Design a protein around this ligand. Structure first.
Ligand code: HEM
Ligand code: II4
Ligand code: II4
Length: 394
């Protein structure tokens, strides 16, 4: 089908033609749900439009939620203490500044050897077995460790934390109350510990900066909400980037050759992979005012879906071969991590995981096969990530 529809597991394999029909025939597309016309919204599919809308937080607000579903915020119950991804400046600004102190090059550097060790352990197990599900065996568990590092969770608690994490990620995709409470109990304790035993992580930095201090319960709640932002945004996305890259590389032995002969091209290749997999394929904003883009006016008070996945595939920005893998492209201004105030804090961490995974895959498992038609995609309309990638190595 080329007709716009929110994605499902069944339609994640090939959304590209429908994006292309939008970009070409209706770049400011009005969706009026036949069974709910009251809940009409707009969809932006071109790079220029998505890039500007993402930046323009004044016109395009995150404060009412990030889906196309009106009433999202009250329905999930996030009004009183909304996460940072659903705050606009100026409210968003100070917290972002404080938590950013936990997202510097040092933090990505300190976890990289741990990432590499794990990737190696799992890839070697897979090789010995002649393959297995690279998602289950590696692409799922890996990002949970990195989120744990950024939250300053002691390594000894990573297994318990990964349990809560997998429950939450599953419940959140398309429901995890024990996990939510375990996590909220664990972090209440960790926060208290960081008051006297601070490290260089985001939670420590927030505590050291006084968030939650002196009976400031709102401050403490905001740290808890942040842990949820980290778990719900830092796992499934990475798994989509890693798993989604597998078919792309498999079908292009010429592109793998480029990197096998020149492993220094791997960082640029990671950017091209982030462009094409765009794990966050779309997120919404709410207009705060009428805005006209070309011949269409979007009324104030409507949701607008920013199709990052389409923007990243826009021939107007990347040329008529936008749909193809070119590891030497060095694509600029990709939308994979958004743009503006909310630009992904975990961008460097995600890039590092991709670089390490790709590097080791090519060194350890270069003769590998993936059956694309056997990949199973997660449900949910915003993030594209596989639940299973059947993987064989010779
Ligand atoms: C390839 C994987 C990832 C992708 C595609 C991704 C994408 C994004 C996007 C699109 C946003 C902004 C959402 C919006 O437009 O409203 C965002 C925000 C955020 N991401 Fe990621 N992300 C990834 C990995 C991670 C990781 C690993 C972490 C943690 C280590 C992380 C932490 C965050 C945080 C804390 C925010 C909120 C920033 C703010 O609202 O100011 N992300 N991410
Ligand atoms: C205190 C608290 C409790 C429960 C959930 C959250 N929470 C914060 N950001 C969230 C994002 C998603 N997608 C889901 C739940 C979230 C926060
Ligand atoms: C808390 C919340 C609520 C709703 C959507 C998202 N969301 C969508 N793409 C995301 C990517 C990251 N890294 C983090 C959150 C994301 C997050």
């Amino acid at each position: 089908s080329h007709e716009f529809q929110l994605a499902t597991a069944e339609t994640w394999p090939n959304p590209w033609p429908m994006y292309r029909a939008l970009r070409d025939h209706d770049p400011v597309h009005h969706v009026v749900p036949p069974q709910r016309p009251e809940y009409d919204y707009y969809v932006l599919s071109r790079h220029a439009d998505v890039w500007s809308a993402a930046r323009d937080h004044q016109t395009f607000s995150s404060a009412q939620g990030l889906t196309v579903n009106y009433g999202e915020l009250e329905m999930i119950g996030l009004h009183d203490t909304p996460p940072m991804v659903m705050q606009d400046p100026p409210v968003h600004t100070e917290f972002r500044k404080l938590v950013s102190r936990g997202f510097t090059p040092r933090q990505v550097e300190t976890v990289e050897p741990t990432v590499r060790k794990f990737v190696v352990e799992r890839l070697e197990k897979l090789r010995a077995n002649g393959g297995g599900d690279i998602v289950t065996e590696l692409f799922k568990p890996l990002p949970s460790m990195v989120v744990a590092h950024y939250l300053g969770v002691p390594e000894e608690d990573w297994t318990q934390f990964d349990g809560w994490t997998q429950a939450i990620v599953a419940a959140n995709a398309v429901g995890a109350l024990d996990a939510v409470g375990s996590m909220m109990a664990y972090f209440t304790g960790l926060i208290e510990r960081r008051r006297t035993e601070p490290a260089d992580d985001a939670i420590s930095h927030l505590v050291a900066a006084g968030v939650g201090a002196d009976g400031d319960t709102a401050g403490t709640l905001s740290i808890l909400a942040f842990t949820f932002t980290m778990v719900t945004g830092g796992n499934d996305t990475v798994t989509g980037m890693l798993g989604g890259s597998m078919p792309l590389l498999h079908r292009r032995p010429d592109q793998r050759r480029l990197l096998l002969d020149d492993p220094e091209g791997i960082p640029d290749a990671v950017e091209e992979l982030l462009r094409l997999t765009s794990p966050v394929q779309g997120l919404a904003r709410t207009t705060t005012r009428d805005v006209t883009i070309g011949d269409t006016t979007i009324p104030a008070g409507r949701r607008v879906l920013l199709l990052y996945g389409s923007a990243n595939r826009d021939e107007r920005q990347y040329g008529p071969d936008a749909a193809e893998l070119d590891v030497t492209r060095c694509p600029r201004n990709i939308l994979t991590f958004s743009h503006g105030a909310h630009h992904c804090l975990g961008a460097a961490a995600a890039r590092m995981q991709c670089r390490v995974a790709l590097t080791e895959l090519l060194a350890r498992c270069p003769d590998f096969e993936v059956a694309e038609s056997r990949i199973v995609w997660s449900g949910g309309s915003y993030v594209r990530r596989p639940l299973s990638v059947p993987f064989r190595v010779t």
